[PDB]
Symmetry: D2
Subunit: 377 residues, 4 copies
Amino acid sequence: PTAHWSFETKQIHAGQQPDSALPIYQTTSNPTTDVVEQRIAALEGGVAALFLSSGQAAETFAILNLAGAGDHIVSSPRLYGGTYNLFHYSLAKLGIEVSFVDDPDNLDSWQAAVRPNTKAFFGETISNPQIDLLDTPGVAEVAHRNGIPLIVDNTIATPYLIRPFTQGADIVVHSATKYLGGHGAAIAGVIVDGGTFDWTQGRFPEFTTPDPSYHGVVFAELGAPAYALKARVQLLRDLGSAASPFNAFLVAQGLETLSLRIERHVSNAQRVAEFLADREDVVTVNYAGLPGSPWHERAKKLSPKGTGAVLSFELAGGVEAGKAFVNALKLHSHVANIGDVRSLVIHGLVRLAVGIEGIEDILADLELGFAAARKFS
Amino acid sequence: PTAHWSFETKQIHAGQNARALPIYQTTSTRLGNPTTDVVEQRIAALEGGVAALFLSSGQAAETFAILNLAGAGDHIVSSPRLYGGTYNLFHYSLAKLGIEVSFVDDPDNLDSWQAAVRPNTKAFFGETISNPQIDLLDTPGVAEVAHRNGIPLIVDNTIATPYLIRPFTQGADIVVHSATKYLGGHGAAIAGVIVDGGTFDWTQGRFPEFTTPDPSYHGVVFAELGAPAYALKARVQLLRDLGSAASPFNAFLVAQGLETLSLRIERHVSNAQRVAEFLADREDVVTVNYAGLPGSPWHERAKKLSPKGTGAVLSFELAGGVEAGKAFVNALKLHSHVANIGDVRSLVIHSPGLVRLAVGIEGIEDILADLELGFAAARKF
Amino acid sequence: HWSFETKQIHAGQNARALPIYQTTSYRLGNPTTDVVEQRIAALEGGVAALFLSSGQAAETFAILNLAGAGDHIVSSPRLYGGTYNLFHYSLAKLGIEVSFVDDPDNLDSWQAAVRPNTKAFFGETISNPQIDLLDTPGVAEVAHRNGIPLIVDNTIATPYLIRPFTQGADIVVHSATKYLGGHGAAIAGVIVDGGTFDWTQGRFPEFTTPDPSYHGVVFAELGAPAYALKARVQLLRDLGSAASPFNAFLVAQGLETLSLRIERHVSNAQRVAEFLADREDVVTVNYAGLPGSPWHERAKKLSPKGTGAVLSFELAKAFVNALKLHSHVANIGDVRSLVIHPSPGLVRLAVGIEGIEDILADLELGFA
Amino acid sequence: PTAHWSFETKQIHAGQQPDSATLPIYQTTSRLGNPTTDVVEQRIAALEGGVAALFLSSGQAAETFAILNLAGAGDHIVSSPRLYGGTYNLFHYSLAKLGIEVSFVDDPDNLDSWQAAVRPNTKAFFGETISNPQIDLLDTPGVAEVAHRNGIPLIVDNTIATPYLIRPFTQGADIVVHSATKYLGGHGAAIAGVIVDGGTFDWTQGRFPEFTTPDPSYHGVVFAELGAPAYALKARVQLLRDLGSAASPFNAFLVAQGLETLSLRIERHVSNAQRVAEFLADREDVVTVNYAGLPGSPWHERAKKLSPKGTGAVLSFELAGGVEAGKAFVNALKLHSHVANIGDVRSLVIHSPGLVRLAVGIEGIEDILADLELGFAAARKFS
């Protein structure tokens, strides 16, 4: 019907009421949330999505939907600190062991980490501060040949740059707090089900055994959105990481301009990267969009429109130069979250999430940081 | 400082040129929020606790209350008189996480609680008033068994509210509410809250997570933080990792409900009492469950633990089983079939002739007139 | 059929909370705001209501729906300061002359102020800081025998205490900012049409002439809610004092406990009034609920359940500075008690729903 | 300090707390102002380069307050006849009842007509920078020059252009009005109006005694003595105080959020609208297209001078088959909304004989064009 719509059309209209041509159902007796779920699914080309209280809860649910006590996960070591803390501390206490591969670019390393109780592979499509790209097709190929699904976090790339289901991923997670909502005004997470994975190959008896908690349903018999439905009826029901309808409303409102924002974030980031790479007082820049990045060729293949809005770089003067540089910035925020419209310092490496301000104001602000770092030759 | 205020004053001012609460609708600590902080402090003040943690839902509050103490290989002892959502959490989702929840046969038998104690038991759990039984938990008695084994007692105080029972004064260590219900009061904001009594010694030996430097959080030893150790641990570990965060807008809405809590519970309770009496006096009603009725086995317990009343939920049995009850609920014109317990709106839900009501704050005579419609309809069966 | 209590939750409404139609799509009605209007109309017993950006806009619309340049209004001098400013300054600029009777208790003064171009009488059912009660039946019969409608502001009394349509008023105005919303969280006004006035008697050709701005409609031929409908399709359309659906939602939330809050505000205020009257260091107390008030007997007739929650008293700057619980900034009609020291020893209170003993404790700190 | 910032920086940062580096909703009635609303006022004023702004309940209220701040009973306004129907209704019906006479010039491009309508009681000139359905541009410098030589201020409504395309204070306007409901908020989610004071007009020349006489309603203040923002301050302390057209803080929050992407949205609205215009102009079954961005428009040269980045997102056109063709065309559209407001991100039909009026959204251009083809297939039965 509307599958052929462009991205731009979808970010406004996908999931809308069939007679629209968005009321906040702030009730505990959800239609507001369902629209935002349908819209995000449509942007990723997934079959269904589940909107939740935060990105942390989305990562939690993505894992817990498959794994419990005595189960195992294989993860890239290149992780957001909040995901690492979840995997390494709180999940370990629930009897889920998360192993990290030595080098996520080494496909043999993923294979070697596979164990009989492994329930998923996990990685981030673009990680920070490295600004690598995951080899989603190659990692997915290893997972699938073992009967294991691949979960990826696509927060930094967004669906505008990468639709990982087209690359082999089975489950996509976003911190909607960040780019999807875009305005720093609503904490939210979302899990998107690709509907690409066969749940009946052996490792997932919870998908093939009648669930006495829910009318004896066998989730795999629900077809493509099995995983998403199971997460809603078991995890959301029991663990209760529900999204406020008001937050759903706000994220839907931010989604209406997603492509426009990402286009500007990305062109600003590319320019900041290039600016930095050309300076004598910068030792190195990490940004896949630069010709010299080790992941630039991969970016041309997997993410041709750009490599997100986050970058990092090292100053010649080391740790003290880095501190002096960041503490001198006036326009860059020190309190904003990645994925806001605002430029910010992410809390000798300096880490920036580049905003949609005027590029000349952004570069003038960075010159303040360079002036401050100058005392630390 | 202001611990001496009345409940009425606290519900408006506790935690606070007094005025309405602004909404910090912002994701820029990310582990606190000025709007939510105030609601936490207020709910803590109303229960007489030392700290509280406000969350996405009541379900998440139950979840966090258990997970803050128990992980894979651990054990919990619960009353079998449980809200369906808590039952499912305990029996399905926690089991998956390696946590065994054992239910006592009869929660009024204190020896049964003792007998269920195991070396890996990490808490006792019960609801101060359960539904549809409308019993009261023997909070003092159950607490005493828990404490003599070095175990804390967690209670859900949702139906009673802090206006009727402050369980910390009866031996509970941790209190959970679905703030979705009575606390917010208007059916407008899904939310949960955990309140820490600060009355339990975490160093007796079952809780090495409280006595061991935490590598995730600067080597802090939670027990050394004193009275609010449990609340702080839950925030810095569980909310941090698991992310059952509340929207600041939902906290604002709950605050707005809190401002009238005691007024609303007073009328919910006076109405519910009258509905119960009304029902107990009818010949086409087989039995009524409600602790405020003299005939209830928990009536005397209510006089000691909850003298102002026994909440606003009740149930009762009709002569004709399922079929009389189906047409009873189908005839009501004022009672909602979709509103949540703890809304201002009366609601109805269908022993096979068992009808369950959460009595609202509508005019009593309108409520009773509406029920007569139900009786008439059921009398075709 | 339904009691006030059931109406404040269900009037206008598988009952559940009101959704928020936060949207500018199609435009001069909104489903969230519609419910709050019907609800408030049900509580006052009117035929229709119109919910607006503020009480000031409600006063403004209530006059401008009837009067334009070259017209006249007769008003009580016992007015809220914002209404006085509107009447005396802004409306004068628009060529509307507002005249104030010397004594609003003097029914013959009302009669004497009538002019050929007079388009309404106005008064407040309970005024502040005097805490009189308007003689609504008596002012209304003076108005009506001259072919003129009575507009009253019922903000302080609320519909829980007085339903002025029962006493001869034709239009009622509230600052829903105050007691209706109840929580200091939503600026709003409302006009309620009693549907009790014949608009065709001669002073109102705007009601008996086809409106070329609106399909030649003759507003009087719409029957009972002619006034409310006219205000919506002309004034709201053109002047644009619209309420946010979010503010309507917040006021609906407050309405759900209105009777409960007013009951408590009024027993607290009644007790605070009585407290204050018993004290040798207090010269006088204004509160119609006190047996000594000149308006006490009128209160028994027109407001038997009590006389609002606002009061004032004269002392023999220090008193307020000592208060720790009373807010200096909360608006009248918030849950929070409010104090003001503007007689040169006059103190003004809006008594909240805090515990009465804490309120009186806080006042005792005042007396020091 | 932050004047040199680009438009893009300002739409995010102008008016922010000075320590925001190291937007709460003050939904409190504790009272002619609010920090949430003040941020949105300062940000809009910065985008226009004005000295102050006043944010209000709706665009209708902003038009109302912009006139009533200057005119009461027995006063006069000169207006362009090219007006939004909501403004015309206000001017012609409600303000007329308040004793305010609004005259319309026959042709707003004839500067001598503006002069000829000036009366001793004239308090303002009014026009829209781009009107709809004509999609002309007001001759803001020439109209301003006439106003000013008579000691009269020029009020313009800059809603359709937005501050991204035109800053009318740079072209002689003194007061700017927006329906913030539309493009400023951008998401069809908050009704609002705003009045922006240019700080560019001398109020002491003779026609404005309300600005040079002590006001007993407000401490004997002489508004002109407050300097540049006299007009905005007077509107706040008199009209907002008395007439009460206040904005909900929640609405201000929502508009502030939409402002964060203003330039980006307007860029895409405008390049979409230019493509739709060219597409229509090239069709045999379209008789004419009104859009200033087209070379054929009588206002295209004026656009090149006054609005070089483009001419808004609204257009109109006439179909060959007249009125039935136009109705068939609009009724067949599936993606265009029939209920959204101008200035939403959504494409919509806005409600000569066969005239179709569109506000072009930021959807994918190919999808917008395919939807219009539904309309052309429907119109085919009316040649």
